[PDB]
Every structure is written in structure tokens, then in C-alpha cells.
Amino acid sequence: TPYFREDPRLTGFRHRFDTVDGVRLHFVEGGRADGETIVLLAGFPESWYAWRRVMPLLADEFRIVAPDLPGQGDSDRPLVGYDTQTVAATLARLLERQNIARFYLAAHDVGAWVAYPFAAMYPESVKRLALLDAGIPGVTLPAALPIEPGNAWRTWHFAFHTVADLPETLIAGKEREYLDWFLRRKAANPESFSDADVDEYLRVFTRDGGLRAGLAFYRAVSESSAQNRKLQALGKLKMPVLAVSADQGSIPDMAGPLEHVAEEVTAATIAYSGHFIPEEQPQALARELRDFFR
Amino acid sequence: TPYFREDPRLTGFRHRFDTVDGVRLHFVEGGRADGETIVLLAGFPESWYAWRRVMPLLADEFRIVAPDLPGQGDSDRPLVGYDTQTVAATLARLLERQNIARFYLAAHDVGAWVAYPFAAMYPESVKRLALLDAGIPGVTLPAALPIEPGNAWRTWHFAFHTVADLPETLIAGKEREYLDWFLRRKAANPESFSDADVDEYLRVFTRDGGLRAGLAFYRAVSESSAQNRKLQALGKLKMPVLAVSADQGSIPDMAGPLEHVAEEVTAATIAYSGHFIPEEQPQALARELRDFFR
Amino acid sequence: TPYFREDPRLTGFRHRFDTVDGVRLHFVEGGRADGETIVLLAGFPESWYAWRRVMPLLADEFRIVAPDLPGQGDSDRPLVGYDTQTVAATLARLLERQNIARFYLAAHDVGAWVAYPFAAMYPESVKRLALLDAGIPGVTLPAALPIEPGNAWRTWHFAFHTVADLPETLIAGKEREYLDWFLRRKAANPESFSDADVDEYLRVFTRDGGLRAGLAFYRAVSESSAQNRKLQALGKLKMPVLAVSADQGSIPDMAGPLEHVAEEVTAATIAYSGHFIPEEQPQALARELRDFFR
Amino acid sequence: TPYFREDPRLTGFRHRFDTVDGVRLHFVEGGRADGETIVLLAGFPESWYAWRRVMPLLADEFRIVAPDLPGQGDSDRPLVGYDTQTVAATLARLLERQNIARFYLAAHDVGAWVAYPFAAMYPESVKRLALLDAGIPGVTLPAALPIEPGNAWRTWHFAFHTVADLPETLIAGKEREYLDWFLRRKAANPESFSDADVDEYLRVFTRDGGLRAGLAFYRAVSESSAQNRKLQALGKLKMPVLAVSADQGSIPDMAGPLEHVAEEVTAATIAYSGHFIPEEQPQALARELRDFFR
Amino acid sequence: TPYFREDPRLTGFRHRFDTVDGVRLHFVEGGRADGETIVLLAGFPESWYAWRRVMPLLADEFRIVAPDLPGQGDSDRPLVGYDTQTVAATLARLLERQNIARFYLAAHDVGAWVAYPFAAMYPESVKRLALLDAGIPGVTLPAALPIEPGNAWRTWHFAFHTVADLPETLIAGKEREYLDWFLRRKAANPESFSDADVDEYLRVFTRDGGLRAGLAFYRAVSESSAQNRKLQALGKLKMPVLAVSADQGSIPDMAGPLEHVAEEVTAATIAYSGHFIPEEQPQALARELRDFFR
Amino acid sequence: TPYFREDPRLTGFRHRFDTVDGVRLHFVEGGRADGETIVLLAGFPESWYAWRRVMPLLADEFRIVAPDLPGQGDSDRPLVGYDTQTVAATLARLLERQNIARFYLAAHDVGAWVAYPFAAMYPESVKRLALLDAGIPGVTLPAALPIEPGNAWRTWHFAFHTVADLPETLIAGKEREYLDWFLRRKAANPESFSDADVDEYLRVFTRDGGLRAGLAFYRAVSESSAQNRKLQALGKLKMPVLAVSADQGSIPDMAGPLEHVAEEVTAATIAYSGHFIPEEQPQALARELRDFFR
């Protein structure tokens, strides 16, 4: 038996590791043993931990799997392979090895970057797709982003992260301030993140290669964009897509651009939420997901 | 007589200060006493010093005035007023007290941001206008800027600079690294800047309020942008305009968008030059200005 | 439902955030659900927390809302808008969004600076006004302040705070010493502030932009003064005004100068109190407010 | 013979020390040996060195003595005695020991605070008096000073310096930043002070008891004010008084207020000068002094 | 009602502050409400806290008032006035404001410096006087002090403290070492001071102006001596005076020299005690004071 | 021949070392090869270097030997033996090994402490004795030294140095400040010590065991005193003694008390000099020594 550990708080959820062609991946699994499976993907600068408030609310009805993608949380941080097709194929191999054959997929922020090529490459495993307050490189994320005061703070980090070496130079010694700004400035209510939450995100941020790996997603975005444009030309996604917005989120209109990549788009807006919907309005989000994942 | 000081290197040029409504401005003046006047404006993260290699080349024929704008170099750094109309009016006042009634105007980078409303507001004062490798807020600077790796590094700083407090936090203790990145990464040949050149820019960067004032221009960009849009609607620019591009500059096409704002646009591209045309190709730029300023 | 959090100490009071035209504001609300409403404003270098000892004494009978103004406590710190007309308009928008249409207003220190243009601009929303130990820019705060050693310490900070860049330079690394001096030297009994109290004020003083925002109120005092003198010429305040001074406070006579801006001015002096009346004599002040707010 | 040292730059001027009732005082003396004597007094945060540009211009005609007052430059720093009557009496004793019985007196800044009670107590020794850009405590210096941003930076330091212990706490580790602000922000042209000039003022500023003694003059101001009114009520000054203003100086009108303390007041304004007239416009000032000291 | 706080350890004693002509003074009061009053004064480097072990032992019989003198403990630290006649007058004003008209006075170390001019100036208010291990400047304190190694350590700090600026320079960064030496080296048993006791003395030693004000008493000693010689020429003290020695104290003979200044001198020596009698032998000292103040 | 080095500035003087019963002593020798010999002794906190300005003035006529005593300058610092009889014996052994049998002796400060038992023990070897501004332990140095603020700064260090361990603790890291105070505060003109002079004394002060050995002289003063009382009881010094005072020196009357220890005493006062006569008035001192040392 492989070693696993029960979460000290999420009763019934276990921390596991699995090594997938040399890449060790951390994931948390639990929930209803006989239920349909939900797979949850998080983004920057977070990890599986972002779903920690939604997971126990859905556990009564669903089987729940929340992995740390390569370069996230406690998973390994390879040197290359942060184009989203490679990340999705690695996720597919992790799920295959855990005998997760078909599931609902909900993905937030950069996690949604991974979810689009995943759904496009393995449509047979994704029964329904929910994308939360995020653009998709090359198909819905615009090639240019606003610079006018009032909106720039929402997207300034995109272009910054693509610059070589300078982000590492400026963030050094200022890691907690950088994280603190990202999390608390984009929430509707900053108290949605405790000091203990920031501590946890700082742990995986400053841990060997965390910053390098986080930036690598942005630095591979032009390759990921070209991949998605090739995939989009094969046809729109056929499975139902839920475009989940937040009334104070980063994306003004989620459903509109997604109608160009999916045949059936259902729109939902979460009230009283900034960008971090799974942590800010877990109940409201759980409700939409449970209702859509049917 | 006010105190003035001869430049230890630019023979015939003198450093002066004048106080304009409580605001002291540093400027360097020289050249042919009987000549037609050229006024030279520089941008971020520089000062009058950016023109130090062009100024002696034109001194034989023209009378040259190179001021530090408010918030630049050795000029004072007021707390507000960095919308470009207020900066332009402050500049106009300085020129009046120096009995500069009519002149040619060449402006680089954020200096060019000031040059557009100045020429729009004081049409008679500006004989001819040269704008060098810069967008003008709200009229030639697009409302959205590239995020593709490969072009995003040219413009990422716009949105970053608009964010409150985070830039001061990240730049602290890394002022030289930040400045060095701007100068050497955006030049075609980084040896266009000696270590002594960087030392001089660092001196004015780190002096009392240097960073604050530099950031203040970007943080006021929505207001300048609206101001420029308002004057935009009042007619095209009166006087002839030379749109100077650099083949490796920040702006792909300078002449094109300026045709939307001026009656007579003359196009010029400086070869083998990055963003810092006055320092990278002084001789070629001086010739273009010498021929256009007739 | 928005996320809110009960105060662990002020039982029956909840911490909330609301976003007003891009600016997120923190506020604490509680008290008797069917009572009349009192709105409480604090000044420098404090926050809503300065009312923490008065709030439970009035909660039996009044509805109580204590917001952090823009630039205070846990509210956002915009880059501009610290002229008190803009701040009062922002506060008005915040109150409207909570359907607080008519209320009693009590304001201390810089809080009173915002309270005056608020009462002048929205007289129908302010049933009665209480101003605590403060002058009002341009109408009751004198244009010159004392320099004699026995009095100069009460007002020296005013002019200091208007200087660009030097205050940030001198306070850096001495934030606690600066805070400690203000709170404990201006109270009649320095033990009115515990170490945990200073810790709390130090937390919000040192958070992103805390010093910048606190200083911005003083740096905009000339615009705030010009605004108030225009409002004063439209007529004096129409609602009853309570001028509360402290026998050891900063202002020798509150009622006197205020008779020129309000029609019915009632005077009260709290004994055994320095400048921080709500923290130094909370019952005495609660009695005066309870009696006046009828 | 006592040890003395020739100034390496001021030809004909010697640095001397003399002990005056336990207090060692440094002074620079030179100029025409049989000429009439000018005594030069400087203020905060300077020393005899502030007169270094005027002294050689007048040395042809006058014997010139430039002392460091107690608490200034290289003179001792007693613990008490910074009320200006005691400082003036100490200066008288120094001059008596150097056989200087009658002289012209020119005094700048806090030096002028010493000059007024000196002139009032020893009228037979002061042939004529020149006061430069300074108010005199209790007589021409107002009891309250302006606070509008625009003129507040000119006088903010007065009240600050009267505060016990906080100025030492805030200035510690920022001595050069504090000095640099005072000298360069208050001059019409900041290049009137070289780096080596700031270095010299920093040397005497950071030397044992330097800050304590400089601040002590402001802290004794109320005693100094009371002394001066006792003298000012005993009759106007008898000798001619030259009130020297600067067009960009700290004080709007010098001659006006001085007409109440002296029978014969002559007005002079030095053009293109900030507060530091002896360093900023030495030739113009020397001409005014030579012309008046007649 | 003024704010007061019960001492967490001393039953029946309250911490208070009162403002006396601008100077806020901290004091601890308690004991038998209708009992006769004892006022207790401490010296360097201590505070009211030095009496904390004697105070409960006398509280059954006497009303007890233990103030921090100006410059001590949590009392304000004015800039000047540490000549002991001025301190005594400040103490007198504090006692009058508390309606303490006639009382017993027991004073230790520099506190005894204050008590002698107090009793000479206000003989009707001092029923009886106890002076503990201290000389009186100019009157019992010798003009020269020992240099022999075996005893010079008892008094070396006297002359050291009068030196300007050098003490601050040497003690900086060594405050705890300096205090520890004073308290523990002069006690007969160094365990008379716990680490928590040293912590408390360090807190008030290192607070704003603590070292400055502590030294000021010694720096004004020649003014205090001249004052005491004038007072002594008016006649010897008429009330009974108790001269309290310690067998290992700083002063070899208390009673001898005091017979020249007081008419009735009672001698007492406390055994097994160093200089800090109130803390080292509280019960023996309390019995002597009780027997003498009855 | 032993290695010796010529002094780089004092031409004709050589630096030498010799070992005396395990203790290396550094000394400088030069002057008239066939002249009579003067041995020169310096004190705290100096070395032979204190005589560098006197040595060349006498070198034309006299043979001059200026040693570093044990614990001074570049000589060894033994662990014990700082009673002045042991030091004098160590000096005697050095002079014998260099075949200096009879000579004039001039001694300053602690050097004079050594000169007295030397002259008392080896009278045939000392032709004449000159003592410069110093008392002699137990015979001329009083057992108590004055503590008026006006005079305590001259002698406070005696008692301080006798305290175990605290001087090392307080002086650590402040060696230059401590030296600077000693040298420049006791000179009539502090410019008698250059920064290079202070550098030289700081070098030997800070050299390993420098502070320990310097303090050891003061810590042994009581043994030295008892030795000196025994020797004096054997008779007055029989050779002529010159008592050299300074008009601003440490010792008010030198010749007076010396009349009790020597048979014939000549008095001389050097004008315009603080304590450090050899450095402050080298020419005046050279003339007096010259006239007496015949």
C-alpha cells in the first residue's frame, strides 16, 4: 500500500502522491465512494487548497479529486512542459493511473487553461465542463489587455510574468507581499483569506522552484495559444460548458467568447465574489456546480 | 543675475533653474545665440541628459533648450499635476519666462506625451513637431497592449505602473536592476549606455520622490488620455509633424496612427536603433531633425 | 450573502466590506435593529477601532455604523481623491448602498473634516451633527498654527505632513515610534492605549499605502479648504450641531468658530480627556451623544 | 602664542579657538587688520562656513570675524544656555577677549535671533546691524506660522524642533537626508550647495551633540521670546538696521515688522536668491553690506 | 472621572496621571483612606516601582502616594527644569491638586535631592523627613568623590553623568548592561532584582527621553547645589529628620553631615542592605519608617 | 644588528624593540650621538607618539629616547605588573640593556606616575626630573577628585577605569569616539590632533590587549599609591624637579604639592595649552626643557 494521510480538517479526504513518468504529483481525494466524479483544477498563485471550502459541500453526493498540477502546490516542478497540452496530457495520465475514466471537470484561473485542451483532447472523459473567471490562451484570452487605471491592476501580471529574469529579481525578499497583493486585492472581501491561508500559499510559493514554475505557465502562453488554435479548428467542444462569472471578477463577459469554442454554453454569475470564487462564495458555487453536473 | 553653471562636457551649454508657480525646473540651454530654437523633451526613465549626444551636433545652427519636466531629473517633484495638460501648461510658462515664443519641438517617450497637448494648446508657439518612438495616451497609444511573449516585454510596465503601492514595494532595494533592465533591454546595443550613464539615471531615479513622480505620469494616464481625446475632436494638429520610428523601437508604426491627429505627417525610421533613439543614433537623428526643422 | 464576520469582542457587531465605484471600504455595523442610526467617523492615525468603546454603550438604543474612510484602516487606498468633498461623496455612496438614508453623524479629527462637506452637501441625510476636537479646513481650522513650545506639539504635524517625500523618508523604520507618540502624548492618560491597541493601529498604518493615504488628507488640505469656503457661502449648516471639546484636547474653543457655519450650535466639554475623546472618556461622550441624538 | 591654522581656501583667514568661561568657541578671522570690523553670524543648519563666499569679497576693506556660536560648527555644545540672551552674552565675552569693542553686525537665520538681543544689550558696540531673512522670537517672528501647502514647507520645522525626543528619533540614520532637504529645497538654485558643502555641514551636524544643540535653539524659543519683549519694550534699537530680504526667501516682508523695533530701518531685497543669501548671492549681498556698513 | 487602573499586584493601589502646568505626571496611590499620608520618592535608575515592596507593608496604617518625578518612570520628560527647586515645586503642585496638604516624606537617592529643597521651601507641609542613602547637592554631598578602586565604583557615575553627550554615546546599545550593573552590583544580594524587575526598569529607561531626563538631574547639579546653599543659609530644617544608612550602602555616614542642615537628626542603619534599601530590606525599612512617622 | 626602521617623518630617529625579561618594549631613539640623554614618557591614552613634535626640536642638542611603557603603544601588554614600581623597574631594565646609565627624565600624565618611583628608586640615574600636568598616586594625587560639572569632566575617567568589566563593555565598538573625546575635549584647540593622529592612537588602542592594559594602570592605583608613600617616607627626591603646568591643563597647582616630595622644585606654566602639552605647545615646552636640562 502507498502511504496516504487523512486531511486534519477535511474529514474523509486523503492526501496521496503518484509518480507519473518521473513527475511526482500530489492530489487530494475523497467524497462519495459510489458517486459520479468531479475533478477540480486551481490556478495561480494557488493549489488544490483553493477548493478546500467547496470540497466538503459536494462530498455528500460526489466523488471528488483535487490535484496539484505540475508546478503547483506540493507536486514536482519539472524544468519544461508548461505548455498546456503537455500539462493536460500529464493530468490525463495521473487520472488514468487512478482509474478515473469519466468525470465532471471544474477549473479555475490557470486551471481553466489546462481544462480547455484537456476537454478538446479527451472529450470522452469529460461529461461536463465548468470554467471559472478565466480566459483561454489563443481562443478567448485576448492578445491585448487593458491599460487604463481602474482595470489594469486586474491583468498587469500577465505581461510581467512573460519577461525573463526580471520578475524573479523584483519578487525576491518580497514574496509574501506579492502573494498578499494577489490574493487580497482581487477578493470582494479580503478576510476571505486568513493569515493562515496566506501562510499556506506562501509555503508552496517559496518552496523549491515554486516561483519559477508559476511563471513558466505564463512564459509558455504563446505556445499554449498556438496549440489551442489548432485544437479549436477541429471543431467546438461538444460537451456542456458552464461559464462561471463573478460580479466583481476579472472577466466582464465569460459566456460570449466561449460560444466560439463550445456548442452549448450556460452562463452563471456568482454574487458578492471577486476572482477567487471557490474561496469567496463556496456555497453559491457548489450549488451551481451540483445543479449543472447532472 | 541668477546662478548658472557651465556643463563640464557640453561646451557652450549652461545649467539653469527657474521657479514657475512654486515649481522649480532645471534646464540646460546653449547653442547658437542667434539661431532658431529647438526645445527637447525626454521621457522615462531619463532626463534632459538623454539628449546630451544630439545637443552638440545641432549647436552650430540652432539654439537649444533641454528642460527636465516636473518630476524629472533635477526638477522639483510636486505631489499632483501629472496629467499632461497641466505638465504642458507648466512647460509653456517656463518657456514664456525664458522669452521662448516660437520654436521647434522634439520629444521622446513620455516627453512626447507632453508634446501633443502642448502643440494642440499652443499651436502658434510650435513651429514644427517631432515625436520619437512613443505612443500618445488616448490618441495613438492603444487602449489594450500586447501580452504575447516576444512583444509583451516592450509595454508590460504601463499597467504595472498604474497599480498603487505595489511598484514601490517591489522596486525598493532594486532600483539599479530596474533601471538597468529598461535601458539595456530596450536598446539595440546595450553598450549605448556606459556604467556612468546608468549612474546618472540612478542618481535622479533614487533622489527624493524620483520613483513616485515617474510612476505618477502613468497613474494619471486615464486623465491625460481623456484630455487628449477632447482636443483630438477639435481638429488635426496644425503644424507639420515628423513621426520618427526606430526599426527596433517600442512602437511598430509611428507615422500611421499620427495621421489620425495631424494634417501633414512626415515619416522617418532610424536604422539600427532601439527605443532610445537620441542616445543610440544621435548623428542620424540630428540630421533628420536638422533637415526637418527648416 | 456577502461574507461578513462577527467581531470577537464587540458581540453583535459585524465586519463588512462593500465596493463603491472601484474602491473597497471596510465598515463595522451593529446595534439595535429598529433603532435610529448613528454614523461614526474617525481620524488620524486611527480607524473605526477608535469608536470601539463607545459603540457597545450606544448599541442598546441605536443602530451603529462605523466605517473606515478611503485611506483608513482596512479600506482601500486610492491614488487620488483625498479632498474632503470627494471623500464625503464616496462615503455618501457607501451609505446609500446600505440604505442608510437618514442618520445622526458623529465625527472625530479628520473624520470631522469629511463630516462638514458631508453635512453641507446632504443636509437632509444628516439629522444632527456632532464634531469632536477638530478644526475644519478653510472655515474653522486657522490658516496659521502655534509655534510656542507649550502648544506647538499639538499641531506641528499638520505642516510636516504637507511636505512631499520627507515625511516618508523620516518615518520609515520608525512607524511604531511615530504612532506611539501621537496616541500617548496627546491623551490625558497614556494608559488609555494598551500595547495591543497600538499594535492594531500599527497594523493598518504599515499596510500597503497606509502612510501615503494618511498623509494625502493633509496634502490635499488646500483643495479641501477651497471647497469648504464655497460651501460655507451657500448658507450655514441647517441641522443642530454639537461641538464637543476636551479639556486637554487639541482645540481650545470648538463652539466659538463653529457658530459661523451652523445655525444652532450646542457646546459640551469632556473633562479628564485629551484629544482621543472616544477612547479616553467613552461613557461621558456616550452620554452627550445619547442626549443630543434625540 | 595660541595655535591657529590658515584656511586652505580662504587666503588671509585663520581658524582659532578660544575658551570663554569654560565654553570653547571656534571662529574664523581675517581681512584688513586695521579696518573696521564686521562680525558675521549664521544659523541652522549651518556654521561660520555659510559666510565663506562673502568673507573674501569684503576682506579688502574690513576686518572680518565669523564665529561658530555655542552649539554650532566646531564650537562646544554646553547643556544649557541656548536662550538668546545667554548666547549673546557669550558672544560678547568672546569678542571682548579678542579686543573687538565696536563692529558692524550682520546675521542670518538663527544668527539673527542672537543679533537682536545682542544689539539691544550692547548698543555701544554695534555700529550698524544687518538681519537677513529671519524672524526674531517674541518681536517679529509671529506666534503662529502658516500651514497651507505652498508656504508650510518653509516653516514646518519650527514647531517640530520644539518637540522633545521625537526629532532625534526620526532624524537618526537620516541626517544627510535631513540636511540635504533643508539646504537644497530652500535655495533658489540647489547647485548653490555642492556635495562637498553638504559633507561639511553633515560633519558638524553628526558630531557630538550637534543635533541636540541645533534643536536646543528652537526649544528655548519661548524663553528667548520673553527676553526679547522685555528688551523691546525698553526702547527701539538705536543703531541703523538693514532688513535684507530675498525674492524667494522664507520671509515675505522683513522691513515691515522691523520698523517697530528700530528707529531707522533700511530695506533691501536680494534677487534670484532663496533663504541662503550669503551662499546663493554673495556678490550682491557683499555690495549691500559694504554700502550700508559706512 | 479620570481614568485609573488598579495595580495587578499591589492590592488597593491605583495608577493615575495628572497634568501639572503642561507636565503629565504618573503616580501610584493607595493605603488606608483616612490614614496620615506618606509620600515616597525614588532615584536613579528607578521609579515609583522601587517602593513596591514597602508600600503594601505600610498600607494598613498610612495613605501612600508614590509619584514618578518629572523625568522618571512613566511621567513626562520636559526639556528643562531638573534643578531640584523646580522639581520640588512641580511635586508640590501635584500634591496640592490631590489635596495632600501635610504629609510624611521618605526619599531615596536622587529623590532625596528633591526632598531637601522641598522641606526647606514647604516646611509646613512636611511633618517629618526620612532621607535614604544619599547626599544632598551643595549641602551634604562632598565636592570631591573617591578614586580608590575599592570604593570608587560606588560613586563613579556622578561625574560621568555631568559630561555632555559622551554618556549617551557609550550607553547606546548597552542599556540593559548599564542598568544591570547599577541595580545588581550595588545590592548586597543581586537576587533582590529579578529579571522581570530589570525588564521594568529597562522599559522606562529606554522609553522616549528616559536616558536624557535621568542624566539631566546630574547635569543640573551645580544649579541645585547653589539653590541648596541659599536655602541652607535661611536656617536649619525644623521638622524631625531621619537619616537612613545601609551597612553596604553608597554613603558611609548619613547622620553626621545632615546635623549641619537640620535641627533634629535621628540616625538609623539597615543591616544586610546595599544602596537599594526599599527593595533589599523592605520590612526592616518599613518598621523604621513606621516608628519614625508616628 | 637588530632590525630597526627609520621613522618616515622624524629624520634621524629609529624604531627599535628589545625584550626585557620576556616583555617586548618598543621605543624610538635618535638625536645627538654625543649629547646628553633625555628619556621621554607619555601617558593615557597615548604613547611615545605624543612626543613627536618635541623630539626634533631637542635632537640637535640632546640624545633622545622615547619608549612605549608596558601596556602602551606597540609594547607588549603583560597580564599583571601595572603597579608603578614594577613598571619603573621594567623601564630601568630596558635603559640598562641599552646602556643608558644617567639621563634627564621628562614625563607626562601616567608617565609621571612611573617617573616618581623611578626617580625615587634610581636617583643616581636621573640627573633631573620634569613632570608634566599630572598628580602622583598617593603623594600628590588626592584620594578624591572634584565633581562640579565644570570640572568633573576632567577627572571622571579615574573612578570609571577602576570598575571591573563595565568599561570594556561600554567602550566596545565606541573606541574612536572614546579616544576622540579624550584627546580633543582636553586640548585648548582640538585641531592640535589631526584625524591621522587620532588614527594612530586608535591603532594602538584597539591593538590586542590595549584597553585592558590602559585600564590596568588605573586599576592598580591603590597599590601604586602605597608603594609611593613608602618611598617618599625614605626622603625627598634629591635631584632638581621641574613642575610643568598648562594654563588650561588638568591640574590647578602642580608646583605646590610637589614641594613635599622634592628638595628643589622649579615651576613653569605653558600658556595657551590644554592637558596635552607636548602636542599643543611643543616649542614652548622644548625651550623650558632645554633650559632646565643643563
Author numbering:
A (entry chain J), B (entry chain I), C (entry chain G), D (entry chain H), E (entry chain F), F (entry chain E): 16 to 309
Article sentences:
Here we report the biochemical and structural characteristics of Cfl1 and Cfl2, two Cif-like epoxide hydrolases from Burkholderia cenocepacia. EHs that belong to the α/β hydrolase superfamily of enzymes utilize an Asp-His-Asp/Glu catalytic triad to open the epoxide ring substrate and release the vicinal diol product. Cfl1 and Cfl2 also appear to utilize a Cif-like His-Tyr epoxide ring-opening pair instead of the classical Tyr-Tyr pair. While Cif and aCif exist as constitutive dimers, our hydrodynamic and structural studies revealed that Cfl1 and Cfl2 exist as octamers and decamers, respectively, by forming rings of dimers.
In contrast, Cfl2 shows very low activity against a diverse set of epoxides. Each assembly is formed by a ring of dimers: a tetrameric ring of dimers in the case of Cfl1, and a pentameric ring in the case of Cfl2. In Cif, the equivalent residue His128 does not form a hydrogen bond with the catalytic water. In contrast to Cfl1, the catalytic side chains of Cfl2 show a much more similar alignment those of Cif (inset). The most striking difference is in the canonical dimer (1:2) interface, which is 1080 ​Å2 larger in Cfl2 than in Cfl1 and has a substantially more favorable predicted binding energy. However, this is not the case with Cfl2, which maintains the epoxide hydrolase motifs in its amino acid sequence and 3-dimensional arrangement of its catalytic residues.
